[PDB]
Design a protein around this nucleic acid. Structure first.
Ligand SMILES: [Mg+2]
Ligand SMILES: [Mg+2]
Ligand SMILES: [Mg+2]
Ligand SMILES: [Mg+2]
Ligand SMILES: [Mg+2]
Ligand SMILES: [Mg+2]
Ligand SMILES: [Mg+2]
Ligand SMILES: [Mg+2]
Ligand SMILES: [Mg+2]
Ligand SMILES: [Mg+2]
Ligand SMILES: [Mg+2]
Ligand SMILES: [Mg+2]
Ligand SMILES: [Mg+2]
Ligand SMILES: [Mg+2]
Ligand SMILES: [Mg+2]
Ligand SMILES: [Mg+2]
Ligand SMILES: [Mg+2]
Ligand SMILES: [Mg+2]
Ligand SMILES: [Mg+2]
Lengths: 145, 53, 104, 187, 141, 141
RNA sequence: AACGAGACUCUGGCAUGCUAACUAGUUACGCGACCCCCGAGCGGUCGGCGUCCCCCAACUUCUUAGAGGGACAAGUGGCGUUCAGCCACCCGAGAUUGAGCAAUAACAGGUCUGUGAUGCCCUUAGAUGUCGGGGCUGCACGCGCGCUACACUGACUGGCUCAGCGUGUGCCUACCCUACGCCGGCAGGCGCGGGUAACCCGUUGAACCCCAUUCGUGAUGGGGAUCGGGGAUUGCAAUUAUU
């Protein structure tokens, strides 16, 4: 049964062909599993066929939905980036847009040296956690002199 | 003289204090006692509470 | 004229409450007033549990204080004057009695 | 038929016990026939009262173990039901007799106590025989199915089978004879 | 036969298959992009979940004729796993429970009773017991 | 000249009251056939009195049952104890005495607590430990 | 002879015996109404489902809570210097329910930071008796009580069906538990009633469990730390992120 090609290289990442298509495309960053089901539902695709059982034209139908979600009627409260701080847009950053958007956000913070920027710099915990008995990476110290 | 002699004390531990010892820190609000946890063991009888459990 | 009228009794000591109730029943049935017997509402128990120690030292013992509340009702079918009269009599100890206009 | 009872399906009256030592301590026939391995059963109130408990219920109780099963008994009954249904296929024989066989051939008839590592050899009471056999063959199953695709009913079934005919491929038998050799040495 | 005479799961499947055989019973637009409660972690598998949910809702109204939305969300509550903290009981979604009860009034099966709440119309109970008999006759119950 | 009787059964604060009367068959509980009480893994438990006594005794009585309290399993034993505690008091009142001695010995020899309630109830927690007998950990050094 | 033990007080287990209940019910029918034939019948009648509506019907089994009753090693058989008692068994709701209370003499135990209980010492207007801001949360490291997990005796998605102890509008103080309708995916918002409480939330539709679907031995859909972005509620104020 269905012995044609399985693995597919969706943008910049190797989507394995074996897993169910829902749990197949999650190997993309910025695309969790709750977002993926919506994308596939709005793409009309069956949800009982692996990644190997999709031809070369459905996959474009899915990509264009992942990239332009606002227009395929996926509401504005699903998108991971909202009222984007620099320009007011709403969208899902996908693969390296996620890396660069985190990078730019940390740079934006450090630039005006906000209390979070310095915590990202010093490599500490940024939210309000106690730090006396947690994290605890370093090496043991001795009382001897 | 002064118009700055208080700032809102309308909830939390600043609001309330024991009806006997005037302390804060560990008072019983249940049933409207409003009584310090040490002061209540002292009058726990005259109110009527009796230990028999 | 003849009215329904309900007396509600509350206390914490049971014997006073029960003896009060039985005496009111007596005084009502000596006039043949068609009394509906005492209904015993569920007793209530107030619980307060605190550390024994004044400061923070010791093994961690607790007290378990509790107070009990008993409550019952009796119902009468009669004019008001006889009931407010006999109610007004024969209560020596510490017991709470409240009588209302009508409850039926 | 109505004088006779089944676990829905399986008959009791065709069973046999060949160890005359264990005839007092395995309950299966007659007044110990019950429809289900689930009774309230205040057994653990006196000393020997545990001997009256129907053997299939004892096999169920000893199965809900290791923490995230404490109490869940209806799962255990639905496990045992399935295990017997598989056993009737893998052999074509009565499941109850296979259980009775696998209990009889797992009780270590000699153990070594500790006195000082210095041990001594002693013989085990007829009640401890069954109390150990049950433990061993329920641990074999729970152990064989911890990260495998097999299901606990499948492993419990093949465990009962490979033990009812002492085969050195079953956890129970290995551990029993290994507990006996250590006694044999420091006799 | 009434509804209490028959197994309460295949009855639900029959009622759902019947409700989704009339073209009536308008479903909300967001039917395919909704978690269904605060404590779930995924959207329902069954693409027709609204039909099943409306079927079960009607059955529940049959057995206890005075529900209202504030208990449909309790009848449907479940257990929330708060990450690294102990779980806790959590309610359903108010909005879908409301839109389900509204969709049933359009079939004249439900009406807002005295006091406040909802109950089945006389015509709703017939629609139920008919497929109850249908179930009992299919499976021979 | 009505001919009826009522008796209860308890198991861990789960009371089930059975009312048996003149009739023909028809043993129900909360309105369902006893074939369909929910935890159906335990079905042979609540079929035990009829499967043990034979449907010849369950031939002139109709026995309805109302249950409330406890948990799922602790109500199977309430029911299972109440109906058999009933067929033994409908006999003892409207039949001869020596016929009920047959029922009681077919019953009590198979499984007690089809007539005598378990006296076990939960023990009460104490300060110091999580439950009734355990205690919190003790860190010496 | 006195204290401690025991006795005692509360609680759990049994009463189809008593007392008696629209702020608990049940059974009946006076009912009537709805619905299906689901069975005789036809569809009514015979019946079946009802937390549908009634009764100025009958009663107290279920509910509530008062007075008494019951268990005494009392009966039977062994072991006991035939004593004090132990062991097994019968009848039984039960032959060992769980707590509270507790002696003499002490400890350099803890507490002056519970007290308008308190001796002595100190400070007392440039205060050690008030407002604004920060800290008690600061992190190379050592320890203690814990929570969630390492999965198939499982995770996810639907479906089905069961509790018990409780608290509830606040006397300065100023806030309570929530039904039902509507709006919003969600947290939440608006509207309009009940409750000073066996009366309303509430027949407290609790989770595990139970039944059916997807996954497949792979750090995988196990696990859910850390981190980015956005939306609400509390408050005078949320940044070191309250929730
Ligand atoms: Mg109560
Ligand atoms: Mg867990
Ligand atoms: Mg516990
Ligand atoms: Mg006692
Ligand atoms: Mg009681
Ligand atoms: Mg009712
Ligand atoms: Mg008494
Ligand atoms: Mg003697
Ligand atoms: Mg007996
Ligand atoms: Mg005692
Ligand atoms: Mg002492
Ligand atoms: Mg002091
Ligand atoms: Mg001093
Ligand atoms: Mg001051
Ligand atoms: Mg300050
Ligand atoms: Mg601190
Ligand atoms: Mg400690
Ligand atoms: Mg689930
Ligand atoms: Mg805080």
């Amino acid at each position: 049964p269905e012995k044609f090609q399985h693995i597919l290289r969706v943008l910049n990442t190797n989507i394995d062909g074996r897993r169910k298509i829902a749990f197949a495309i999650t190997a993309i960053k910025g695309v969790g599993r709750r977002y993926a089901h919506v994308v596939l539902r709005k793409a009309d695709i069956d949800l009982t066929k692996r990644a190997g059982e999709l031809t070369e034209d459905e996959v474009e139908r899915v990509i264009t939905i992942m990239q332009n979600p606002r227009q395929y009627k996926i509401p504005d409260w699903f998108l991971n980036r909202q009222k984007d701080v620099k320009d007011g847009k709403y969208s899902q950053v996908l693969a390296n847009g996620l890396d660069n958007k985190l990078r730019e956000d940390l740079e934006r913070l450090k630039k005006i040296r906000a209390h979070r920027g310095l915590r990202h710099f010093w490599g500490l915990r940024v939210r309000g956690q106690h730090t006396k008995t947690t994290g605890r990476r370093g090496r043991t110290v001795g009382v001897s002199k | 003289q002064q118009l700055y002699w208080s700032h809102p004390r309308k909830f939390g531990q600043g609001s309330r204090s024991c009806r006997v010892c005037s302390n804060r820190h560990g008072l019983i609000r249940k049933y409207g006692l409003n009584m310090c946890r040490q002061c209540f063991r002292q009058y726990a009888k005259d109110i009527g509470f009796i230990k028999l459990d | 004229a003849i009215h329904r009228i309900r007396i509600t009794l509350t206390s914490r000591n049971v014997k006073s409450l029960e003896k009060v109730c039985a005496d009111l029943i007596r005084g009502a049935k000596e006039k043949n007033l068609k009394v509906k017997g005492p209904v015993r509402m569920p007793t209530k128990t107030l619980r307060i549990t605190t550390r024994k120690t004044p400061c923070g030292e010791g093994s961690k013992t607790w007290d378990r204080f509790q107070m009990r509340i008993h409550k019952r009702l009796i119902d009468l079918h009669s004019p008001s004057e006889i009931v407010k009269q006999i109610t007004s009599i024969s209560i020596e100890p510490g017991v709470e009695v409240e009588v209302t206009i009508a409850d039926a | 038929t109505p004088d006779i009872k089944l676990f829905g399906k399986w008959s009791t009256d065709d069973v046999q016990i060949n160890d005359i030592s264990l005839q007092d301590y395995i309950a299966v026939k007659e007044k110990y026939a019950k429809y289900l391995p689930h009774s309230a059963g205040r057994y653990a109130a006196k000393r020997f009262r545990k001997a009256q408990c129907p053997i299939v219920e004892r096999l169920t109780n000893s199965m809900m173990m290791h923490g995230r099963n404490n109490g869940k008994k209806l799962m255990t009954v639905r496990i045992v039901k399935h295990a017997f249904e598989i056993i009737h296929l893998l052999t074509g024989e009565n499941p109850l007799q296979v259980l009775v066989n696998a209990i009889i051939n797992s009780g270590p008839r000699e153990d070594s106590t500790r006195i000082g590592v210095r041990r001594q050899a002693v013989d085990v009471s007829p009640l401890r025989r069954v109390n150990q056999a049950i433990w061993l063959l329920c641990t074999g199953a729970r152990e064989a199915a911890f990260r495998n695709i097999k299901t606990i009913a499948e492993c419990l079934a093949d465990e009962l089978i490979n033990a009812a005919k002492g085969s050195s491929n079953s956890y129970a038998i290995k551990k029993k004879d290994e507990l006996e050799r250590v006694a044999k040495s420091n006799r | 036969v009434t509804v209490k005479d028959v197994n309460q799961q295949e009855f639900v499947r029959a009622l759902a298959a019947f409700l989704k055989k009339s073209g009536k019973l308008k479903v909300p637009e967001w039917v395919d992009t909704v978690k269904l409660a605060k404590h779930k972690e995924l959207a329902p598998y069954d693409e027709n979940w609204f039909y099943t949910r409306a079927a079960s809702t009607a059955r529940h109204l049959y057995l206890r004729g005075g529900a209202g939305v504030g208990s449909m969300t309790k009848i449907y509550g479940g257990r929330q796993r708060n990450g690294v903290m102990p779980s806790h009981f959590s309610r359903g979604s108010k909005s879908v429970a409301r839109r389900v009860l509204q969709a049933l009034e359009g079939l004249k099966m439900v009406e807002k009773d005295q006091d406040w709440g909802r109950k089945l119309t006389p015509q709703g109970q017939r629609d139920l017991d008919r497929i109850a008999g249908q179930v009992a006759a299919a499976k021979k119950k | 000249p009505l001919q009826s009787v009522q008796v209860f059964g308890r198991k861990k604060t789960a009371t089930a009251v059975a009312h048996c009367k003149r009739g023909n068959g028809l043993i129900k509980v909360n309105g369902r056939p006893l074939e369909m009480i929910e935890p159906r893994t335990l079905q042979y438990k609540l079929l035990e009195p009829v499967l043990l006594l034979g449907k010849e005794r369950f031939a002139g009585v109709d026995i309805r049952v109302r249950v409330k309290g406890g948990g799922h399993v602790a109500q199977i034993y309430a029911i299972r104890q109440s109906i058999s505690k009933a067929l033994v008091a409908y006999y003892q009142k409207y039949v001869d005495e020596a016929s009920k001695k047959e029922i009681k010995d077919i019953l009590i020899q198979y499984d007690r607590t089809l007539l005598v309630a378990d006296p076990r109830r939960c023990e009460s927690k104490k300060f110091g430990g999580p439950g009734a007998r355990a205690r919190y950990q003790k860190s010496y050094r």
